[PDB]
Nucleic acid binder design. Structure first.
Ligand SMILES: [Mg+2]
Ligand SMILES: [Mg+2]
Ligand SMILES: [Mg+2]
Ligand SMILES: [Zn+2]
Lengths: 57, 120, 241, 50, 68
RNA sequence: AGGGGCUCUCGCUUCUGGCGCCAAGCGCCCGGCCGCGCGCCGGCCGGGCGCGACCCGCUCCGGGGACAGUGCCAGGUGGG
């Protein structure tokens, strides 16, 4: 619809029951979920790789 | 320490602005409201279209001032003719005065109101 | 001993590209209004340029303890205000009405203010001491006064504060103040302060008159030239010997 | 228009407030959307970096 | 005598003191705007011999003219 | 082999079309409550400061610069 009819609509008709719902699609929601997860996991493994390679002079 | 500029921009610091306490009023008295109700309503219209509006749509029709709006016309009619007004439709004529149709509330009757006014 | 396990040190690092910068102090990098920029650059300009000795002498002000001692002495002899003055006039009128008569009764010694007044006093050798503010902002109403007091041999001092002079003479600002003759119990206070001031100013006037001022570079420039001098000396000291 | 040499719309993260800032770099040939570009004295010598 | 000393000093315009003062005041008048209100006369002896008196109702305006 | 003087080091972001502000923590204080009721003293509700986020400093930072430029005069050129 037009934006001013969006004003007089209801919240359910304007969004989807999901995080980022009504602004992003489900596919890119899933991709951003697993991208956030995997990048945090890679940061964890680099930190523990240094922490195990503290074994030199 | 401990006052710190956390912004690279100096803004004009807000100061006190006093209200006016004048030593004398610039004019003596308040001006008279020259648009009172008798100034609002000039006279009724008594043409054949006017009579049709009276007997059909329970509505009167006046020639009123050019400065008057629908609220002032409705209040002036309800006050000096002691009736109730459903609505007001106004136009400006090609001579330059405002013709206002005023439709009354249904419990009142345009026939006997026009009889009390004397345009009948 | 009973501490909660849910509390946790969660630090944030403010490296480049990491968590955003804290609201630290920015006071050196502010876009200041033009009058602030004007007065700061005027102060900077005075320090940078070669300032002639007739203004350097006004830069050379007085020691703090002797300044406070002189102010105590001047507060002893400050002029009178309007209300106490009119009290004096009404008291004089009632005693004249009854009954001893004219009675000038030894009109007290007082300070004398204003540059025209003290110029007349120095010119006719009436003043015991002259005190001149160091920050007369049109600095040409007083630049002749040290040479004049030197030639007439009256001891003069450059005090640090024009508002302080003005407050002792009950106004906003005042340029100079002259000391004329004083009562007997403060003659000794003078008889220390006058030769202190004279040894600080009149006896070394030629050094003052030829000593120039200003002409110092900025901190960045002196750091750069000091880097260059130590970066030559650090190997020249090893070449020598 | 009136130019043809394409422009790259690149989004950077502002370092002093929570905001994202967009630039209009001249696009060097070979760069593509979704890639990262780096700006600074310690950026690596790749195509598109500053 | 003070105003006479200021008058002779302002006639000695090519002295080092006066050329310093003139250059620094010219710099700051250049940094100010073109039409400007001064809070007090810069040259009080000149202003009073031209008619100014230190009363309420005498004001001083500094004007900058592009010369040539 | 403990180190200081001597430099690069007082630098923490590069496999990914994610997120990031409005401070956690520590230390020191101030108030009320019951209250051990014996005081750094028990705990319950609050509030502040500092470090976190080093200290000073005189030009915001960088590039030029007594040239350029501008004013006035002088010579050339000037069918625009
Ligand atoms: Mg929906
Ligand atoms: Mg209409
Ligand atoms: Mg021709
Ligand atoms: Zn997608």
């Amino acid at each position: 619809v037009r934006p001013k009819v969006l004003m007089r609509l209801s919240k359910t008709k304007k969004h989807v029951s999901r995080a980022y719902g009504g602004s992003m699609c489900a596919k890119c929601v899933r991709d951003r979920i697993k991208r956030a997860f995997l990048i945090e996991e890679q940061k964890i493994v680099v930190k523990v790789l240094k922490a195990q390679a503290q074994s030199q002079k | 320490k401990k006052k710190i500029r956390t912004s690279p921009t100096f803004r004009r610091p807000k100061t006190l602005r006093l209200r006016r306490q004048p030593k004398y009023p610039r004019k003596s008295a308040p001006r008279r409201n020259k648009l009172d109700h008798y100034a609002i309503i000039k006279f009724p219209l008594t043409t054949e279209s006017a009579m049709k509006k009276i007997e059909d749509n329970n509505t009167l029709v006046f020639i009123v001032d050019v400065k008057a709006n629908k609220h002032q016309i409705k209040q002036a009619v309800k006050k000096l003719y002691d009736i109730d007004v459903a609505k007001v439709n106004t136009l400006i004529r090609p001579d330059g005065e405002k013709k206002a149709y005023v439709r009354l509330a249904p419990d009142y009757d345009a026939l006997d109101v026009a009889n009390k006014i004397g345009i009948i | 001993k009973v501490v909660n396990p849910l509390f946790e040190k969660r630090p944030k690092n403010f490296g480049i590209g990491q968590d955003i910068q804290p609201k630290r102090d920015l006071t050196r990098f502010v876009k200041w209004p033009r009058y602030i920029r004007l007065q700061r650059q005027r102060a900077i300009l005075y320090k940078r340029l070669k300032v002639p000795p007739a203004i350097n002498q006004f830069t050379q002000a007085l020691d703090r303890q002797t300044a406070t001692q002189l102010l105590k002495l001047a507060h002893k002899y400050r002029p009178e205000t309007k209300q106490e003055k009119k009290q004096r006039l009404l008291a004089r009128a009632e005693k004249k009405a009854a009954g001893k008569g004219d009675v000038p009764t030894k009109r007290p010694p007082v300070l004398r203010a204003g540059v025209n007044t003290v110029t007349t006093l120095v010119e006719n050798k009436k003043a015991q001491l002259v005190v001149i503010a160091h920050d007369v902002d049109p600095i040409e109403l007083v630049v002749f006064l040290p040479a004049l007091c030197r030639k007439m041999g009256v001891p003069y001092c450059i005090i640090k504060g024009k508002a302080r002079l003005g407050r002792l003479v009950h106004r906003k600002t005042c340029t100079t103040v002259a000391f004329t003759q004083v009562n007997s119990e403060d003659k000794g206070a003078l008889a220390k302060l006058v030769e202190a001031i004279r040894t600080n100013y009149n006896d070394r006037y030629d050094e003052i008159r030829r000593h120039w001022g200003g002409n110092v570079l900025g901190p960045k420039s002196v750091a750069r030239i000091a880097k260059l001098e130590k970066a030559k000396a650090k190997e020249l000291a090893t070449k020598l010997g | 228009p009136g130019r043809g040499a394409p422009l790259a719309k690149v989004v950077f993260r502002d370092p002093y407030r929570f905001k994202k800032r967009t630039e209009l770099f001249i696009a060097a040939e070979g760069i593509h959307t979704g890639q990262f570009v780096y700006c600074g004295k310690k950026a690596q010598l790749n195509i598109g970096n500053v | 005598g003070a105003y006479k000393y200021i008058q002779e000093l302002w006639r000695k315009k090519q002295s080092d003191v006066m050329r310093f003062l003139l250059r620094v005041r010219c710099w700051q008048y250049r940094q100010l705007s073109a039409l400007h209100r001064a809070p007090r006369p810069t040259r009080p002896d000149k202003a009073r011999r031209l008619g100014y008196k230190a009363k309420q109702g005498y004001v001083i305006y500094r004007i900058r003219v592009r010369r040539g």
